[PDB]
Amino acid sequence: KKQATENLMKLLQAYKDIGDAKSEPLLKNHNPRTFEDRDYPVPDFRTQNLKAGDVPKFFDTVISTRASAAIASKDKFWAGRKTEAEAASAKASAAFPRVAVPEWKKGKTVSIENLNTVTDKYAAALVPKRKLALPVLPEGVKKAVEDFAASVGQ
Amino acid sequence: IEAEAASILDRHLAKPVAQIRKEQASAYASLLKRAETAKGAKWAEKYLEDVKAVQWFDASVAEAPASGPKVAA
Amino acid sequence: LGPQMEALGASDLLLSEQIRVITEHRYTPDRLQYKEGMKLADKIAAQEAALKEELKVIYGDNVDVKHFQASPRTPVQQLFDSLKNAAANKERAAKEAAAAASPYLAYAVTKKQEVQADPSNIPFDEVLYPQLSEELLELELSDIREDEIALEKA
Amino acid sequence: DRVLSLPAVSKNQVLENVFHTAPKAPVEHLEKMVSANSKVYDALNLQSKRVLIWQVKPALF
Structure with a gap:
């Protein structure tokens, strides 16, 4: 299971590398609209001998055929992408950081100064890798501008 | 005993925690009522006197854990 | 036109309950696009529960989720809703760390709140993944553009 | 047959292929x-x- 998780993490690195070498958009290949053919010959209902209530059921099976053929064309993309990344997953780095667990020796105990620096590693990944520097006004400067308005009488 | 305990643990480490706590609470409670339905037998009074003495050990350690249990000294 | 006399985002109903009255109006239940339209109304009602729950912790229980579905709050209003509950958040964490079962858990409910009360740690998907939030914009701008090509052809 | 010029893949089928798994x-x-x-x-x-x-490790008393 540790090797399956290192294989999956190496696979998801191979997916990210060969999708950033091709510079493709993120949502493009998960969108099945992008695998749809808009230049299909679009069957005309006036040449298919439909009766009165039969035309909307003709329209549904032209749509759901052309939608199933776009989903099944998305599956053929990802099944060919998988073998492209599984080939590069076999030649990969596998230098991942380990899960922070508290250090426990064989007959020893666990210090709270190590349970807490482990909890610091969990709450240091709760911060986002790129964030807005949304400023809180501290009370050290929100009072130095409040009483400056209160010395003028506002 | 080393091979039995390593076999018992690896069967137990493959369980989810919710299964473990209720497999053991079912086994603990079934074994209490085998000592509680035993009317006046000497082993059953000594069984439930030792359950009271385990709960003293857990309570005496909770009062001072760096000391241990309290002995009469 | 009936229900289609007002736009998709510009009614008084919530968007999931407006998709239902547009789809009941444009299509009969026999159709494929009635079935795909009522399924879309479930994906949007799933997003309105996840928006009610996200804003239930601030605006109360009568959150008025229609106002924030139509016009979401800006990164400045996410800030000023953080700061208008932070005094009851730092005091809830101090009342919980006092009654935590052990000094491991007492540090863990303050370290989590020390990260969660800082408004600079709110993950903005547009700041984090800029190419993703532009492409999630061009999923709805391309759905509208397909309705505008249908009216230019008409 | 203007509906056959619209994209046949639904808006539903986009939102279930783009948002396939609930993220961690x-x-x-x-x-x-x-x-x-x-x-x-x-x-x-x-x-x-x-x-x-x-x-x-029971204590020696």
């Missing part, structure tokens, strides 16, 4: 390892109220 929260790794390390604190600390040190 950032905080669900904290609050799941913290509750599991609170059992590492309890059993193995020497200041906990339920230490295993008197159950596994």
